[PDB]
């Protein structure tokens, strides 16, 4: 109800709020939100309420949030959270199309806050931006694309058909190189060797203040032996949140455009 006393316990609803012009009263893990999501800027005034997986329950109670928002099936139990203050959990996807859900979640949030018009204006901006950038990729053919991020020297996260990015790749005619298994959120962790299978594809790897790991990884003979690496198709790019919504999707497009 009070638009200035909303606490977002997970980054997905943080993005939904910012899209509607709401300044979050409190946000979980602002530090990492700044380096994993980055693009949508969070003012310094925002109170940090702890890790998304272990929010400072004491601080939350002291704060007396007007409403709390979080991600479905992630973090603290909703039954327990509901004991602190009114709230709503948002879905990232239906297991297949995250962006379709993003548009629904944004509408949902806007209805709760009576910012229906603001939602419509943002959604128009979103669809127009996506469509306007389509010609920037008419040059490339059917060469598939592999989207990844380094978890640790021994494991790479890869994003599949049900990831946030797929809908955009489909609109731009870019095949997704990963057609293997994925988790609900569209990703899966694989050993570095599993990446050697991809002989001629473009590979983007989202940085997240992990130059030390990328160095160790890129120093192994295996990495140097990677066909797409030797072919000069590997590229490190700025961080883009892969479990976000429309803002993350637009940020992806900007990063995508700059890369290919």
Which residues does the annotation place in the binding site for Fe(III)-coprogen?
36, 52, 71, 74, 92, 185, 241-243
Contact between 97 and 167 under an 8 Å Cβ cutoff? The reply is yes
Name the residue among 197, 218, 199, 196 with its Cα closest to residue 207.
Answer: 218
Residue with tokens 């979080």: 70
Q: Where are the domains of the chain?
A: 1-90, 91-260
Same fold? 1-90, 91-260? yes
Residues of each annotated binding site: 36, 52, 71, 74, 92, 185, 241-243
- Resolution value (Å, 1 decimal): 2.0
Q: What are the CA-CA distances from residue 81 to residues 75, 86, 210 (Å)?
A: 10, 8, 33
**Is CATH 3.40.50.1860 what the domain over 91-260 is classified as, yes or no?**
no
Tell me the three state secondary structure of residue 156: strand
- CATH T-level fold of 1-90: Rossmann fold (3.40.50)
Per DSSP, the three-state class of 158 is strand
Q: Is the dihedral of CA 19, 23, 29, 31 positive or negative?
A: positive
């Amino acid at each position: 109800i009070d638009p200035n006393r909303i606490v977002a316990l997970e980054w997905l609803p943080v993005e939904l709020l910012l899209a509607l012009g709401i300044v979050p009263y409190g946000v979980a893990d602002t530090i990492n939100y700044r380096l994993w999501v980055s693009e949508p800027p969070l003012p310094d005034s925002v109170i940090d309420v702890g890790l998304r997986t272990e929010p400072n329950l004491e601080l939350l109670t002291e704060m007396k949030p007007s409403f709390m928002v979080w991600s479905a099936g992630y973090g603290p139990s909703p039954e327990m959270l509901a004991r602190i203050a009114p709230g709503r959990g948002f879905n990232f996807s239906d297991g297949k199309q995250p962006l379709a859900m993003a548009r629904k979640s944004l509408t949902e949030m806007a209805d709760l806050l009576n910012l229906q018009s603001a939602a419509e204006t943002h959604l128009a901006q979103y669809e127009d931006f996506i469509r306007s950038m389509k010609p920037r990729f008419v040059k490339r053919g059917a060469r598939p694309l592999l989207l990844t991020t380094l978890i640790d020297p021994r494991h790479m996260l890869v994003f599949g058909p049900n990831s946030l990015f797929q809908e955009i790749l489909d609109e731009y005619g870019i095949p997704n190189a990963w057609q293997g298994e994925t988790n609900f959120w569209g990703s899966t962790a694989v050993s570095i060797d599993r990446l050697a299978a991809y002989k001629d594809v473009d590979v983007l790897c989202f940085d997240h203040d992990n130059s030390k790991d990328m160095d160790a990884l890129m120093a192994t003979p295996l990495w140097q032996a990677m066909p797409f690496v030797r072919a000069g198709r590997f590229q490190r790019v700025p961080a883009v949140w892969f479990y976000g919504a429309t803002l993350s999707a637009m940020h992806f497009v900007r990063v995508l455009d700059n890369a290919i």
